[model samples]
Target: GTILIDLSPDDKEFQSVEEEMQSTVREHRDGGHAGGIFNRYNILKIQKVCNKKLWERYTHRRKEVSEENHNHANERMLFHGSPFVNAIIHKGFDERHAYIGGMFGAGIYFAENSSKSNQYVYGIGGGTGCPVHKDRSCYICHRQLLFCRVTLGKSFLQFSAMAHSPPGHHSVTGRPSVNGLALAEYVIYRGEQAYPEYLITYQIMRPE
Candidate 1:
């Protein structure tokens, strides 16, 4: 069954991801730009993926990411812009979209920061401008981002683009503000390694 549980602002989990998004945005944020900061009511939702096998595989490697090694490795609550966060509730992260991923090759791309994820909300840098999907249907879909808790079993940090993660490594992380890259970015080659933990739908205007 499909489960898209809408979370309230009063909930700690919701508050935490909300603050985490802003803090990562705050760090090296260098003060607000024309894009502004997150304010007003922010909507967040978490839908556990429906496929039983999906959850099964997610738990297995997730254990390997955490319990199996003294690796100190674990999961990360990161960001990614999806046309609709719900799309992932059933499919999880889609590599089918990766034939054109570019930066770190054909893999699921995500951000450690909102400015980067918001960059792809397919929104114009958090602007109060005309928001719409390219086809111009269901414009509101462009206003959402996912705060998925992804298991980065063992991070293979890359200072520049290209050369995807090697076998021993479980995930890839790109450096922030280097090689002309603007913000923090992450990638995973395997779908089961991630979970679409939260969906944050935004309200456009803010910052006084």
Candidate 2:
């Protein structure tokens, strides 16, 4: 897990928050392992669990917007065989909405839990014999970019370098890509959230 520090940061608040982040991170780290070293793949499973109010809002809005975006559903049907992806595209979000949303969502999730000093990330899924929750999802560093996906409310979104991968990156025979299992379980579990970015910076900054 990555930690964010500020110069002249709040002494009590900063240290307290940092400790909480570290502790939560440690729990997840200990819960999972990569043959001995920390589990690199488990890091990508962190997601901001949604609050009740926001969840209701997302569900209501999704129902309304999805009805007006059947074309988007049809587009997704080409890949997922279901037109449900159309409901996820919020009325006013853009192409990068998914990526930007994930960044913003994560900060709030951690911040909210940290403020209350509650459990941040959990081990709920099956991963290399790890003890973490199945639904945990987080952002992973893909070079200078962050890569992670979440089923935000009614939307399932991902930020991937594969979009920019070379022609040979994907095989015509489909020999099982590296991210297959991780990506597969992302949508399997529930309990994630989609919150508003009213108070946080949605800036796409890299981990320090």
**Which prediction has the highest TM-score against the true structure?**
1
- Error (Å) of candidate 1 at residue 133 is 8.8
lDDT (Cα, tens digit) per residue for candidate 1, span 102-208: 56667777887675666455433434332543421222443667777678777777886323556777777787544343666778877777777666766433545
lDDT of 2 at 185: 14
What lDDT score belongs to each candidate, Candidate 1 first?
A: 0.60, 0.23
lDDT tens digits by residue: candidate 2, 1-208: 1122232234553343233333322222234231122312221112222235545654554454346455221111000101111222222122322222222231111121121111112211222221332322223321011111212222333333212212211101111244332221122111122222211111112234
Return the lDDT, model 1, position 63: 78
- The TM-score of predicted model 1 comes to 0.71
Q: What is the lDDT of residue 78 in candidate 1?
A: 82
